[PDB]
Amino acid sequence: PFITVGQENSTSIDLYYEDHGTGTPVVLIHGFPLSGHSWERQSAALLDAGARVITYDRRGFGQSSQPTTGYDYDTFAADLNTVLETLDLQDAVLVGFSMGTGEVARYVSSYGTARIAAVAFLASLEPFLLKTDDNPDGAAPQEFFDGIVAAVKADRYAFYTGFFNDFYNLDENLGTRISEEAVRNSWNTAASGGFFAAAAAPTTWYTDFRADIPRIDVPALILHGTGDRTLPIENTARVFHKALPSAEYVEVEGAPHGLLWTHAEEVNTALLAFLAKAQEAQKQKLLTEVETYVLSIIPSGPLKAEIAQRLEDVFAGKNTDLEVLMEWLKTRPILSPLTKGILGFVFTLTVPSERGLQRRRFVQNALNGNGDPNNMDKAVKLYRKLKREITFHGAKEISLSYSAGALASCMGLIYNRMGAVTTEVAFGLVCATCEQIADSQ
Amino acid sequence: PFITVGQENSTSIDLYYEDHGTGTPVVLIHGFPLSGHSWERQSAALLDAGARVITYDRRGFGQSSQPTTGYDYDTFAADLNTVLETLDLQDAVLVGFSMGTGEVARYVSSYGTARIAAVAFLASLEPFLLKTDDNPDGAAPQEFFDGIVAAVKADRYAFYTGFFNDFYNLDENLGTRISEEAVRNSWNTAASGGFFAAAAAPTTWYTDFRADIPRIDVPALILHGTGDRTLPIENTARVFHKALPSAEYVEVEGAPHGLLWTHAEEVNTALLAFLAKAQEAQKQKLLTEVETYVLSIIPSGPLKAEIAQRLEDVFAGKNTDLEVLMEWLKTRPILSPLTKGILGFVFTLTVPSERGLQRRRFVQNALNGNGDPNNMDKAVKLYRKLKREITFHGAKEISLSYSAGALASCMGLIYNRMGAVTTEVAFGLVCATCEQIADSQ
Amino acid sequence: PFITVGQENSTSIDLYYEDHGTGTPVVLIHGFPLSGHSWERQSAALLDAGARVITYDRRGFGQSSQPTTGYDYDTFAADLNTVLETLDLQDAVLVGFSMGTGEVARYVSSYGTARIAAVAFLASLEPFLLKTDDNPDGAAPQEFFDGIVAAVKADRYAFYTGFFNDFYNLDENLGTRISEEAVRNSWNTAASGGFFAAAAAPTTWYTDFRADIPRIDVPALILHGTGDRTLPIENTARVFHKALPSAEYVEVEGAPHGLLWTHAEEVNTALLAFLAKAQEAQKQKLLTEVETYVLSIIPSGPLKAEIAQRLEDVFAGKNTDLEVLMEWLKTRPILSPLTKGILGFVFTLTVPSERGLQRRRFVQNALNGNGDPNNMDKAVKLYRKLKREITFHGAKEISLSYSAGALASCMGLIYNRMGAVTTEVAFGLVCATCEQIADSQ
Amino acid sequence: PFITVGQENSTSIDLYYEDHGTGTPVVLIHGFPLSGHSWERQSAALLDAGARVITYDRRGFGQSSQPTTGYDYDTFAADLNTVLETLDLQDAVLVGFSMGTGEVARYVSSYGTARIAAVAFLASLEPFLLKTDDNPDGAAPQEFFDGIVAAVKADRYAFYTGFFNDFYNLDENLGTRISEEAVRNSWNTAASGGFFAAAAAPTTWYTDFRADIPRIDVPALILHGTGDRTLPIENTARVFHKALPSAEYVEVEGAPHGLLWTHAEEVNTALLAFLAKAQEAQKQKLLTEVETYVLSIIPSGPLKAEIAQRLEDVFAGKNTDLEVLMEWLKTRPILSPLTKGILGFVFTLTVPSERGLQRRRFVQNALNGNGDPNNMDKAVKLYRKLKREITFHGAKEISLSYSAGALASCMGLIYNRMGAVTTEVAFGLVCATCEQIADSQ
């Protein structure tokens, strides 16, 4: 798969990307000189843990186009921007490794955290690698980087070999934490990047990210290997944490630069924990928003108390007997049959286990759009559009452009499994409906 | 990026290509069994020297499609034709290495040199490799080539190994001029070409190019390694130069077949020397053409003598005091303010150094399209199109479709730096303007 | 030229008007029985002094329609209203002579001073001409005016003769301050007004303007001839100044009623003195307003202090070395290149002398709309509309309907002299831009 | 009637014009400070002699608008251009008197003689009135003109009096060649021009017309009064004739500047002669063009000889017996009935006297469009458009856009007097028809 990010002469500039799983989106931004596939140990864990995994190959690397332009962090951040906008990612986690940590800082800094729930920096460049008068903690002098450029231009093929040596601490880790075959694959991946990008990349490494850091808005993780020969932990992660005290901070004891493979565990467990903390809060946010919309249609009173208590309990995960819940709703006075259908729908959708219970007649009758063909026609039209939605707000926005009869019919269509959409999209549908109905009062 | 060159059964035949830099187009045609990426040492130099670099992968190789049809030099030349026409290349240099030198000869021969400024043959097949009665200087008998085909069909993978041995003179050059890793990359590239192309390619090697050579119209370079084990310099470059005495001719002392890598600097230097001469000639042509258009609007007389002398001098590179030049123009009688603005524009554009001189009021006033909004509207439209142009003639052609008022306004727009285009495109703009104005007289 | 002010039976009622020069609008309202052309000595001076001169012929006079309705000051003031609204006059000076001074008072009184910067009363009717019990200072009894009406109805032609006698003090001024031919022209003008208007006009002369005077809001001038036989200075200008002490007050020694011609230089000088003060105040206001908009985009701090000081100084007329000013701006830290371009533009526009300095590259680059063709397209569209504007607010209003990119491009267009607009219109453009940019923050 | 020539602030600039008679257009351009009505003695003669008379009032004079802009010969010539284009005048005579002679020279010079058959200069400004070093024959120094401006600004009313004195040589001509009443009317006309134009006009009088004169392409007349006190014949007409030897040249013995009235006879007789010479040639041109179109449809042979002889004779004015002519045509073999109808039409149209002969059945039958309703429908449509045409080429151009059936039907419509058009328009119709028919062969 490709996303086009620009044009170079007669050719467009396309980034290779992958898009796996379902759930909260996690975007992984690889390091030099590798590709999105270098995250494969992390991707597997995130997929098992229930996240949507997005990887892409930076321009000049892996399967992306290989221009001779745009090798700088503003372009790289603009590239990332295009990806996020193209996929309409909401509530995303951005995880960068090495070079990738430059994208994370520069994007957050320039474009803000509108789509972004949390960030993570692994084997970071930050805050500035260039050793100057005003930057004493810098890791190396300018002449040092000039050196790498010269070395890559001389042979890049040979260069990759010595690079992966220190990248992986092969003198320590070969035959132990990394196989000879895994290293061979890495070299092949590097050899496959563009010649121009290979020599141009090292010039972006001493980008000054010092003014980007105060812009970091959302929860952050900083993770570094203490045996990092490529980015000395003392000039990078340790001074970065002083600049962002707020960041959660993890040192991987004796881990090299290429800790994604050698210490995938410690990485994946820690990354997993970070996702886990981010994910539950996001889920809670989703649950409570739904609740306000659902409650907005119910008349104020003690019933509205019983209903809200029940929502909150199933939302907290207390598996309730849906059969008991549904009978209660069914037999509630005052509530309109429409209202009971909406609640009926919400509860079956959110309850931990449906326990093989059949659909309820009172709900099917409540959500049938009065069996009106125009309602049903529009509901089918909305359904088509909702299949393309992946977020709560996108779903809710498109739904609000339809009449309440059509919305109720659409809900029946999903309820009865005549169509299927993602959970968060279904929430947006029922919330648009509640919004429309509440507004009629 | 791809260019489609044909159809095979249900599939189209697409050639992988790249398009880097800006300036005079240089098209690099790779050898067997490698791809456009084998030129990476040359590409870097050409890019630094300020050329537009085009590479593509021959059908059956690198990232191009892998048909089982069209393995012959007429098809290969037709493939090249499609590339050149698709990109609308003007004033291009064609550089072939090994197999690629067959494309260069056959295209020039059949399609002529309309788009082509110069040609270069590196490690050439020419003039005929087959040793016959009528071709005594041929390098080998037919049975020898029949042998290679049989060897590739037997194992191609194993075959590439012994091939790169002699291709690179690895017994001499390994660890010295070529690394083991660079060789590994080459084998990977070869292993990635199509099985059918691998066995079919060697049949095209003894194509008789003897009738193609007299067709070579434009300046040429012949370059060969004297240690070439693959194409014996005595049966190829040395008899080729006798057939084309006119060619500039360079022997690389003890260089193998794969001299692009092993002797890449020297090869790159040679390319610069040829590109540098071709570029200088092209620049001189551009100065000469621009000049005729510019002179066409001036009334015949002694002033027209002073003006032409001045153009020629700045065009020759005599850095003149633009401030002095501009005052002179400004104060010239007879010349219309329009004419003075056009000349004003040309001189600031072509003078070696502007010496931080501010724009001139007499020119801004002359090139303002009479402050007419429709002129300015069209000038902005033209500007958009000119941003996409890279050649003098393409620019001039599109410009001539606009009125003189709009053209003058566009020139003011560039003059005043409200927009930017490449130099040759700017020349096309001012020349279209002169052409339109001259035609009004 | 005509402005339609009403309908009489099958015919519309149209006022003849003229509209000359550029600059601050000055509206001249003639006396009985003459037309807008009676101001010709004043018009010439005002035109030379750099004002926009508007004249019109009151209904029933000169080249206006000659209805038999609407001969009263409310209608006359409504007529004037229609003129001012039709032309969208802003910041106008209203100058009335004789009858015209009734329009000035009644319009200001009823419609307010929204469009009006200053007023002038020459040979005024004010405050009330009718001699009554409650108006002891009145110039004549009712029976006296009844007399004039009767005289005009008897012969108006013969009547004009004796009228111009006292109107001009011909016994004193003929052959001296007024020629016989100038008097002949006056009679011809009068003979050309409508018969009905001639007899109906004198009934409007004893209109009580006593309640209109407290409504005079803006700076005023009262000017009267001490030899006025038509409107005794003692019953008119002298008691009017007591009612409006605030008015600037000028007696023309031995000047008759028709002092516009006989003492035209002195009257013209007086107009220049008032126009000159009003113009200077208006200019100061413009400097003050422009300044707030310009300052609104600059970050608060010491630089903002240096900038404001400089604006104020050039605005006060301290001719500053623009070259020095521009270098300072150019080299200022913190300020965005956009901001520097806007300031660059403002300073070159307001500095007393540009001293033949060329345009600055930093400004041209700052105001180029990013060389975007859509910006430039809209900027050209805006420019067309701005050519039709004559006021700061009209310009600013139309400009605010365009995006900031298009506005910046338009400014570059003017800066680079690719188009031209009046100064106040240019101010409106740069102020709309500042407003748009400030609002983005 | 008005023609709009521009815009001043909120008002358009309209020129008052008149358009009298039918025949060859003669455009009269008045002098300072008078209007188109000053030509009334000439207009009457030209109308009696059978010409179309066009007069207009220069901006600032007579009944034209009175702007404070555009008082210069390029604007005045542009004004004239607009008039000629607005009325689509073809084959026009331009006659200027005094100031008007500046329009004639400047228009011819800049716009060329495309619409213009002949020119006439009466009491000319030419070639340059300013007395300089390079212009020794100039009539006065710059300080002299500066003087007139100052005098007009001082009083223009009084000024006109002394001006008409010398304008008319009233000391010689009053009560003799000009009445006191005629002079009174002149002053009234002048007093009615705009104040601004009166003072601005004299600045245009020393315009250098020396480079305009070589541009005079067409037959010219120069006419001057030897008693001209306003434009000394020695600095104007006499040096002008040296610059244009080719001009027909007439001195009116002891005639003043205002010779149009005082010597209308000598003027009108001479002008009449000039028109008479121009008119006959134009008529001959019209006759011979018609003939080629008419002959183009006839087969080559002796009949074509008889026909051509006859056309030429009636065209030369030999009144022929149309009855005899028509019978001859009617009874001619070979000629198609269509052809006979066309000739029938032409002859009745061009014959001096029809002698009360009834329309011919053979022609009515020939020109009936086959009684086809679509033909007739289009013919009626064409007729509507032809009523708006006044020239041969305009008529012929619009006619050629119709089919031959429709054209023939239209001709029948005119032939049968069911509609009426001017002679030259009718010629264009029959010529378009002949052109269409000839093209079918």
d(CA A207, CA B215): 54
Q: Identify whether A257 is a catalytic site residue.
A: yes
User: Active site residue: D43, D98, D124, D409, which one?
Assistant: D98
Tell me the chain B residues in contact with residue C402 when contact means C-beta distances shorter than 8 Å: none
Rounded to 5 degrees, φ, ψ at A384 are -55, -45
CB contact under 8 A, A67 and B188: no
Partners for C (CB, 8 Å, 3+ pairs)? B, D
Q: DSSP letters along D188-248, please?
A: HHHHTS-HHHHHHGGGGTT---TTTGGG--S-EEEEEETT-SSS-TTTTHHHHHHH-TTSE
Tally the C-alpha atoms within 13 A of residue C137's C-alpha that lie toward its C-beta: 16
The total of other beta-carbon atoms located within 10 Å of residue B346's CB is 24
Cβ pair C124, C222 in contact under 8 A: yes
The radius of gyration of chain C from alpha carbons, rounded to an integer in Å, stands at 26
Nearest CA-CA distance, residue C284 and chain B, Å: 30
d(CA B354, CA B356): 5
Using CB atoms within 10 A of its CB, is residue D48 exposed (0-12), middle (13-18) or buried (19+)?
A: exposed
Q: Identify whether A74 is a catalytic site residue.
A: no
Q: B262: which residues sit within 8 A by CB, 6+ positions away?
A: B168, B169, B173, B177, B178, B255, B256
Using CB atoms within 10 A of its CB, is residue A88 exposed (0-12), middle (13-18) or buried (19+)?
A: middle
The radius of gyration of chain B from alpha carbons, rounded to an integer in Å, stands at 26
Nearest to A178 by CA among A266, A264, A55: A264
d(CA A257, CA A205): 15
Contact with chain D for residue C378, Cβ under 8 A: no
Cβ pair A145, A206 in contact under 8 A: yes
Nearest to D237 by CA among D123, D134, D128, D136: D123
Tell me the chain C residues in contact with residue D12 when contact means C-beta distances shorter than 8 Å: 1
CB contact under 8 A, C19 and D9: yes
CB contact under 8 A, B19 and A8: yes
Q: C51: which residues sit within 8 A by CB, 6+ positions away?
A: C21, C23, C24, C25, C26, C275, C279
d(CA A79, CA A104): 12
CB contact under 8 A, D68 and C20: yes
Strand partners, C18: C55
User: Active site residue: B35, B43, B228, B399, which one?
Assistant: B228
d(CA B350, CA B283): 11
CB contact under 8 A, A161 and B184: no
CA A314 → CA A431, D23, D103, D416, distances in Å? 18, 101, 96, 100
d(CA B393, CA D284): 53
Nearest CA-CA distance, residue A37 and chain B, Å: 19
Q: Which of C52, C53, C179 comes nearest D157 by C-beta? A: C179
Tally the C-alpha atoms within 13 A of residue D239's C-alpha that lie toward its C-beta: 18
User: Active site residue: A224, A241, A257, A263, which one?
Assistant: A257
Cβ pair A280, A57 in contact under 8 A: no
Q: D209: which residues sit within 8 A by CB, 6+ positions away?
A: D102, D105, D106, D125, D126, D127, D128
CB contact under 8 A, B185 and A196: no
d(CA D240, CA D120): 12
Contact with chain A for residue B14, Cβ under 8 A: no
Tell me the chain B residues in contact with residue A153 when contact means C-beta distances shorter than 8 Å: 44
Tokens of C346: 């403002």
The interaxial angle of helices C392-399 and C423-440, nearest 10 deg, is: 40
Tokens of B292: 């005729």
Count of CB contacts below 8 A, C vs D?
A: 53
Contact with chain C for residue D440, Cβ under 8 A: no
Cα four-point dihedral sign A287, A292, A297, A299:
positive
Cα of A298 vs its chain's centroid, Å: 35
Tokens of D95: 């006659």
Contact with chain A for residue B47, Cβ under 8 A: yes
Q: DSSP letters along C192-210, please?
A: TS-HHHHHHGGGGTT---T
Please name the method used to determine this structure. Answer: X-ray
What one-character DSSP code corresponds to residue A222?
E
d(CA A97, CA A191): 20
Q: D110: which residues sit within 8 A by CB, 6+ positions away?
A: D74, D77
CB contact under 8 A, B383 and C361: no
Nearest CA-CA distance, residue A14 and chain B, Å: 9
Contact with chain C for residue B402, Cβ under 8 A: no
Tokens of B359: 């724009």
d(CA A222, CA D409): 95
Touching chains A and B? (3+ Cβ pairs < 8 A) = yes
Tokens of B131: 């040793």
Cα of B428 vs its chain's centroid, Å: 19
Tokens of D336: 């198609």
Q: DSSP letters along D287-344, please?
A: HHHHHHHHHTTSPSSHHHHHHHHHHHHHHTT----HHHHHHHHHT-SSS-HHHHHHHH
Cβ pair B211, B134 in contact under 8 A: no
Nearest to D117 by CA among D145, D134, D95: D95
Mutate to test the interface with C, among B323, B360, B364, B380 (most CBs of C within 10 A): B380
The total of other beta-carbon atoms located within 10 Å of residue C103's CB is 22
Nearest to D424 by CA among D55, D82, D88: D88
Rounded to 5 degrees, φ, ψ at C379 are -65, -35
Cα four-point dihedral sign B287, B289, B294, B300:
positive
CA C207 → CA B148, C153, C232, D262, distances in Å? 120, 21, 16, 54
Contact with chain B for residue A66, Cβ under 8 A: yes
Strand partners, B27: B54, B94
Cβ pair A94, A107 in contact under 8 A: yes
Tokens of C352: 């007393």
Place of tokens 């996240």: A51
* DSSP run (H or E) holding A53: strand A52-56
Strand partners, A248: A221
d(CA B396, CA B393): 5
Cβ pair C84, C56 in contact under 8 A: no
Tell me the chain C residues in contact with residue B373 when contact means C-beta distances shorter than 8 Å: 380-381, 383-384
Tell me the chain B residues in contact with residue C360 when contact means C-beta distances shorter than 8 Å: 358
Contact with chain D for residue C187, Cβ under 8 A: no
* DSSP run (H or E) holding D93: strand D92-97
The total of other beta-carbon atoms located within 10 Å of residue D362's CB is 17
Tally the C-alpha atoms within 13 A of residue C437's C-alpha that lie toward its C-beta: 23
| Letter string b/e over residues A139-157, b meaning 16 or more CB atoms within 10 A of that residue's CB | bbeeeebeebeebbbebbb
Q: B351: which residues sit within 8 A by CB, 6+ positions away?
A: B314, B319, B320, B322, B325
d(CA C206, CA C167): 18
Q: D170: which residues sit within 8 A by CB, 6+ positions away?
A: D164, D178, D183
d(CA A228, CA A247): 20
State the maximum Cα–Cα separation within chain B, in Å, rounded to a whole number. Answer: 82
Tokens of D433: 């028809």
Count of CB contacts below 8 A, B vs C?
A: 80
> Which amino acid type is present at position D7?
Q
Q: Is A225 left (phi over 0), alpha (psi -120 to 50) or beta?
A: beta
Tell me the chain C residues in contact with residue B376 when contact means C-beta distances shorter than 8 Å: 376, 380, 383, 413, 418-419
d(CA C68, CA B295): 72
The radius of gyration of chain A from alpha carbons, rounded to an integer in Å, stands at 26
Rounded to 5 degrees, φ, ψ at C387 are -60, -25
Tokens of C179: 């020629």
Partners for A (CB, 8 Å, 3+ pairs)? B
The total of other beta-carbon atoms located within 10 Å of residue B214's CB is 10
Q: In terms of DSSP bridges, do strands D116-122 and D220-225 run parallel, antiparallel, or are they unpaired?
A: parallel
Rounded to 5 degrees, φ, ψ at C26 are -125, 120
Q: Identify whether A241 is a catalytic site residue.
A: no
Cβ pair B432, B417 in contact under 8 A: no
Tokens of D384: 């509507």
Q: In terms of DSSP bridges, do strands D11-20 and D52-56 run parallel, antiparallel, or are they unpaired?
A: antiparallel
Cα of C421 vs its chain's centroid, Å: 20
d(CA B131, CA B144): 10
